[PDB]
Design a protein around this ligand. Structure first.
Ligand code: HEM
Ligand SMILES: [Ca+2]
Ligand SMILES: [Ca+2]
Ligand SMILES: [Ca+2]
Length: 402
């Protein structure tokens, strides 16, 4: 198994790491900031220092084109992507696709979702028991973002168990063949759904994008259109959930911060920014490929290598954030790499923040006696190189507020 080199040995992507990766991240930052991880499916490098991570995001030698892993005499005949999602592309196709979908995620559009997000959260809360067992992950944190993405896109509620199963396999330590099969089912499902939508459109996003694609296939191809639906669905199932889970947990394990929020509920948006920093939901950005040799902190990563940008690590770098290990919901937030940086910066950043403050804010308002129903040490985390997220969170809700 892998451990940090230097003065302190901490497990890496195994052992104690899943439970609490933060000491390992700190030892990487201090003593091995540009680290090659000899992982089972092949070596992946990891950058953990804030100044390196933030700049890496705008360094074009750090490419999304997986063909950089091939020698040139092998690249000609290969597709640009395994599936034509914009997150797996460089300009110009990235630029074109992002500009197109960005038109549907304008500031005004996402905000007008607040009354509905609030109904959804309020309905979930009303349905939770006072003292019987609750998994706050499956019953609350998971539900909000998934209902929202289904409504935004126009995804049948009756198919929710099929595509949430597919989506989670793609995001965790599943075997590469399992991921391929899940992606296959998700592509076919969404392809068939789009075919049905042509015949009966609705007013939600997938119909709108299908119409753009119908009108102008060079702006958005059919395959690009399915890939976009796939990406938006997976983001709606596997990200915000862990903002909610990690942020709730931060408050449950920090009484002082929970009390400040109780006394000023308007601290919630500042609190959300602090949760995104303190326990980043996307722990490592999806992989980049070195198109040429790059040098960061005195270490050269050769051309052709796979590279993770360590967001959870960088967001606790004391060179950037004083007392990075302290949870302080009152910080005036700025910077941060939890939503990425540059051209691929999170498309759903406004949506995620809104879902987070609504879900966490309304939860603690409604159930001011919420508590964990197990010891902190008993919490099980998912094994993922992409997310920092609880598997389940046993809680006791307590009485509704009067
Ligand atoms: C707290 C929740 C979220 C976190 C922490 C997060 C994190 C990120 C990060 C770090 C990136 C950049 C990855 C990279 O450059 O390699 C990204 C991109 C992206 N995100 Fe988010 N995300 C969240 C929620 C959402 C939501 C709700 C959506 C729904 C629309 C979404 C959709 C996308 C898309 C489509 C991209 C690709 C953007 C592009 O390639 O231009 N995300 N996200
Ligand atoms: Ca119930
Ligand atoms: Ca219409
Ligand atoms: Ca500094």
């Amino acid at each position: 198994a892998l451990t940090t080199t230097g003065t302190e040995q901490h497990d890496l992507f195994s052992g104690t790491f899943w439970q609490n990766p933060h000491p390992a991240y700190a030892a990487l930052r201090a003593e091995d900031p540009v680290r090659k991880l000899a992982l089972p499916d092949g070596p992946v490098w990891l950058l953990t220092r804030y100044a390196d991570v933030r700049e890496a995001f705008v360094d074009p030698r750090l490419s999304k084109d997986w063909r950089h892993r091939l020698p040139e005499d092998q690249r000609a005949d290969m597709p640009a992507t395994p599936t034509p999602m914009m997150i797996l592309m460089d300009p110009p196709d990235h630029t074109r696709l992002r500009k197109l979908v960005g038109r549907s995620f304008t500031v005004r559009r996402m905000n007008e979702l607040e009354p509905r997000i609030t109904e959804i959260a309020d309905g979930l809360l009303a349905g939770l028991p006072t003292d019987g067992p609750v998994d706050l992950m499956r019953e609350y944190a998971f539900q909000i973002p998934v209902q929202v993405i289904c409504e935004l896109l126009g995804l049948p509620a009756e198919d929710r168990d099929d595509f949430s199963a597919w989506s989670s396999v793609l995001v965790d330590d599943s075997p590469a063949d399992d991921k391929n099969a899940a992606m296959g089912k998700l592509h076919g499902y969404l392809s068939d759904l789009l075919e049905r939508k042509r015949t009966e459109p609705d007013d939600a996003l997938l119909s709108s994008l299908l119409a753009v694609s119908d009108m102008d296939g060079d702006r958005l191809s059919q395959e690009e259109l399915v890939a976009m639906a796939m990406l938006l669905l997976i983001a709606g199932h596997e990200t915000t959930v862990n903002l909610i889970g990690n942020g709730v947990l931060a408050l449950l394990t920090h009484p002082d911060q929970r009390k400040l929020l109780a006394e000023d509920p308007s601290l919630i948006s500042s609190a959300v920014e602090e949760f995104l920093r303190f326990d980043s939901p996307v722990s490592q950005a999806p992989i980049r490929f070195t198109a040429e040799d790059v040098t960061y902190s005195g270490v050269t990563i050769p051309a052709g290598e796979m590279v993770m940008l360590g967001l959870a690590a960088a967001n606790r770098d004391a060179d950037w954030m004083p007392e990075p290990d302290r949870l302080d919901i009152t910080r005036d937030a700025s910077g941060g790499v939890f939503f990425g940086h540059g051209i691929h910066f999170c498309l759903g950043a406004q949506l995620a923040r809104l879902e987070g403050r609504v879900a966490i804010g309304r939860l603690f308002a409604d159930r001011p006696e919420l508590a964990l129903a197990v010891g902190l040490d008993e919490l099980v985390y998912r094994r993922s190189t992409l997310v920092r997220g609880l598997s389940r969170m046993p809680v006791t809700m307590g009485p509704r507020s009067a």
